[PDB]
Symmetry: none
Subunit: 380 residues, 2 copies
């Protein structure tokens, strides 16, 4: 029982007979997979039984489209990254600016190392936010995890979160028993998540048993939010209105370390290693898993020839006002760090603080009508 | 499905820790599963590694359906129906209107014994269709089949179908070779299976690797078609405009017999036993696998307070114009026999002809300002 009968059954076919048809594909996985790599890795399994087929399924199912390259693969556990390193390493190097198999990732959650960021001009910066994801050692990741493992993650997380006090006193809302009123309240506060609709996620198996053992915790102040068992075991978000990113990041680090110490005592620390930093399902999110950002009104700078170039130079990214696929209603852009792996949490938020400060100074010159042609920084 | 099929850590959790939460689920699986059944069968697997969790996943994920009552489980191979018989048999009994473990599949080949059905009123009955499914013995079914297995089924099936002659002369059209426009036209014209959007198809693992090794075979005038590797290895279809169900059924039965003769001669017989008849993925499609029905315009009858009761009395199922996952458009309903095991093809098509003729007579009475109170049919 509970063995490898399934993969052994597939191994009755030759490697070419099981090899995916990637002729229409444009994703990182398809860029790297070869007939030889598939042949060499198809009989391998992690201790939990995760296989190369499981790693690549989403990339097989979702070819991609013209420009933006999707990753096209997932990890099912920490071991996936080692057992299938011959696939993941080139993907990680390509996705994360050349990060090599021998490179090390530096973690830094000491919020005191951030400099400034309490001052971001409220007239332009409408809100500040820091998000990360975390995995819990001892449990496989959402593509793979059993109902039993998922429930164990939820129990540990909820008991931990229920123990928090002061600024971090809060309450958990299971998706399965959520009242209509609770759901509406969470929507009003931009705290709700629903079953994923993205085929990139659905194709990996991560949505099984929905909504079993999924839920949302937030503190009474509505400034610290935790999603349980969505894309990763945990998603942890600190947010508030205005431009005190210093306070947002402080709260983020303190709450994250409080949770960490409880998990560590239970023998289930956050999944982490010196090479990849914090381990998560998607290779794109390794390292810090961190997206620190602001909603910032850039009426003129938005409509400027070098706007996309300035973001690139500052190592920043932009999205709409309502998320990843939105058109920035009014003039409000979601600006955040582009980096994840090979730089620390402090370094990434510092880039956001420093970069957003410069871009507000730039916009102030533009609304007067001065030239933005000297403040343009070197590529960071 | 997915990696979770072979998650080796399920061993490490208690049965009650892995047991699904089926509270407020309304499908046949959830009506039957118990803690004891789960405990008994959770450590079992078929020779290809299909497990109880794979059987039930769609019924966990899909508590209900917007249009019909669903079975909530699938088979992954022939052996599924034996290994997990204690779950399947009560579901089959419920779904097929009382078919007991001691009852036997029925067929004759006597399609000419259909009484009437050559003259369904074409003002109401816009098209007539008869389908069934077949599985190739020795290959796993769509929820579980590997890319290699699926490809093997496609290769042998196309070779066999290409040997059809006479009114059944046709050819194969691989899904990957169709343009978006060509695919959409075939779907709009009701010939080709939809994009992989069914909650059953998705949740159970049947959409993996799409569109690899899927396609449609058909004769030149598209009156006789075979889908390859959608929900079943084969779906054999006869259809045409208008109300000559007898002719549709003639073509179906003669064609199906030619197919099975060809497959047997090639050494690729279908999955079959004396109890369940022909074995297919969904328990609802066992026995003859036959779903015979019409697109019928019921503007008045569909608004009558006893519409659903009448359908139940007649043992007919209602679906949308674009099939099970769609709504009726322009009051055009897909009306077909609900049950497939414990009766023959002729009995099934006779039940459709008789029921549809009654419903058309009801529609006509309601159009004329008369009532149908006196015409409600006895429970079949
Ligand atoms: N700086 C911000 N201020 C307020 N809300 C934000 C901010 N950044 C993101 N959001 C909100 O969080 C949601 C998720 O955004 P999304 O781009 O998916 O973010 P992430 O991937 O970090 O979760 C959106 O609905 C959006 O309204
Ligand atoms: N009587 C009919 N006439 C024309 N098309 C039909 C008829 N019945 C079903 N269909 C079509 O068959 C396709 C599949 O519908 P679906 O509900 O999935 O049925 P099946 O049991 O064959 O899988 C749909 O495109 C639908 O419009
Ligand atoms: C709609 N189905 C029946 C069911 O889900 O019970 C099919 N496709 N087997
Ligand atoms: Mg997001
Ligand atoms: Mg169908």
């Amino acid at each position: 029982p509970f063995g490898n009968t399934h993969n052994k059954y597939k191994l009755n076919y030759k490697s070419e007979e099981e090899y995916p048809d990637l002729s229409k594909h444009n994703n990182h996985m398809a860029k790297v997979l070869t007939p030889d790599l598939y042949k060499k890795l198809r009989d391998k399994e992690t201790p939990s039984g995760f296989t190369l087929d499981d790693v690549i399924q989403t990339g097989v199912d979702n070819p991609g489209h013209p420009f933006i390259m999707t990753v096209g693969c997932v990890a099912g556990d920490e071991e996936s990254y080692t057992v299938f390193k011959d696939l993941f390493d080139p993907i990680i190097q390509d996705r994360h600016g050349g990060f090599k198999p021998t490179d090390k990732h530096k973690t830094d959650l000491n919020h005191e190392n951030l400099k400034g960021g309490d001052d971001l001009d409220p007239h332009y910066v409408l809100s500040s936010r820091v998000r990360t994801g975390k995995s819990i050692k001892g449990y496989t990741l959402p593509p793979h995890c059993s109902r039993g493992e998922r429930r164990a993650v939820e129990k540990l997380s909820v008991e931990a979160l229920n123990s928090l006090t002061g600024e971090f006193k809060g309450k958990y809302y299971p998706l399965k028993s959520m009242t209509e009123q609770e759901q509406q309240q969470l929507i009003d506060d931009h705290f709700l998540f629903d079953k994923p609709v993205s085929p990139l996620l659905l194709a990996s198996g991560m949505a099984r048993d929905w909504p079993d053992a999924r839920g949302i915790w937030h503190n009474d102040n509505k400034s610290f939010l935790v999603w349980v068992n969505e894309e990763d075991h945990l998603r942890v978000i600190s947010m508030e209105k205005g431009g005190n990113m210093k306070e947002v990041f402080r709260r983020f680090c303190v709450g994250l370390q409080k949770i960490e110490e409880i998990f560590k005592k239970a023998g289930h620390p956050f999944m982490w290693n010196e090479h990849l930093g914090y381990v998560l399902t998607c290779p794109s999110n390794l390292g810090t898993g961190l997206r620190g950002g602001v909603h910032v009104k850039l009426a003129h700078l938005s409509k400027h020839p070098k706007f996309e170039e300035i973001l690139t130079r500052l190592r920043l990214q932009k999205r709409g006002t309502g998320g990843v696929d939105t058109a920035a209603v009014g003039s409000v852009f979601d600006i955040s760090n582009a980096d994840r792996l090979g730089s620390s949490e402090v370094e990434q938020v510092q880039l956001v603080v420093d970069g957003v400060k410069l871009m507000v100074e730039m916009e102030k010159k533009l609304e007067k009508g001065q030239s933005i042609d000297d403040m343009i920084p070197a590529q960071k």
